[PDB]
């Protein structure tokens, strides 16, 4: 297992992929969460270019935190995750948006609000175990 909360320095550009493999810690019935935050600095309270929060079995919430303020919330009811199963997230950094694949198919998209070049850290946390975290070279 990798450390959770998991915090890493990153550098991203168009064409980068952030791969995350993990497993929910508890039954979906109890709504475990997963959160992935693309931050502008190493500090945890720094701004967030992409906030991706899964309410397993319920919904997905996406947003940005700009100058310490949460902006317009984006919601999805797509729930391709499977109770108890390991999942593989691939967050593709496209020219216009982040695209979040689950097990190789895109389910969530978030247009860039902050330039991708401002992202310097990614934190993965909440109710998962983590077996892989990789930023493409």
Ligand X SMILES: OC[C@H]1O[C@@H](O[C@H]2[C@H](O)[C@@H](O)[C@H](O)O[C@@H]2CO)[C@H](O)[C@@H](O)[C@H]1O
Q: Is 67 one of the binding residues for a copy of itself (CB under 8 A)? A: no
CA angle 107, 40, 22 (to 5 degrees): 40
Binding a copy of itself (rule: CB under 8 A), the pick from 125, 128, 130, 133 is: 125
Q: How many residues bind ligand X (CB under 6 A)?
A: 8
- Work out whether 33 is an interface residue with a copy of itself (CB under 8 A): yes
Structure tokens that stand for 89 in this block: 């997230």
Other residues' Cβ atoms within 10 Å of the Cβ of residue 45: 9
* Cα→Cα distances 56→18, 64, 136, Å: 20, 20, 26
Q: Which stretch binds a copy of itself (CB under 8 A): 10-18, 21-29, 72-80, 88-96?
A: 21-29
Of positions 58, 82, 131, 136, contacts ligand X by CB under 6 A:
58
The answer to whether residue 31 forms part of the interface with ligand X (CB under 6 A) is yes
Binding part of the chain for a copy of itself, among 73-81, 89-97, 109-117, 120-128 by CB under 8 A, reads: 120-128
CA 68 to mean position of chain CA atoms: 19
Please give the Cα distance from 75 to 85 (Å, whole number): 23
Stretch that binds a copy of itself, among 10-18, 74-82, 99-107, 118-126 (CB under 8 A): 118-126
Q: How far apart are CA 31 and CA 127, in angstroms?
A: 9
Binding residues (CB under 8 A) for a copy of itself: these are: 5, 25-27, 29-30, 33, 37, 44-45, 68, 123, 125-127
């Amino acid at each position: 297992l990798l450390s959770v909360p998991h915090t890493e320095s990153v550098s991203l550009s168009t064409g980068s992929t952030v791969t995350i493999k993990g497993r929910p810690l508890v039954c979906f019935f109890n709504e475990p969460h997963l959160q992935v935050d693309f931050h502008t600095e190493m500090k945890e309270d720094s701004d967030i270019a992409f906030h991706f929060q899964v309410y397993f079995g319920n919904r997905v919430v996406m947003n940005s935190r700009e100058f310490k303020i949460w902006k317009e919330e984006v919601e999805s009811k797509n729930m391709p995750f499977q109770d108890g199963q390991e999942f593989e997230l691939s967050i593709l950094v496209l020219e216009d948006k982040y695209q979040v694949m689950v097990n190789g198919q895109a389910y969530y998209n978030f247009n860039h609000r902050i330039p991708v070049s401002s992202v310097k850290m990614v934190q993965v946390w909440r109710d998962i175990s983590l077996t892989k975290f990789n930023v493409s070279n």
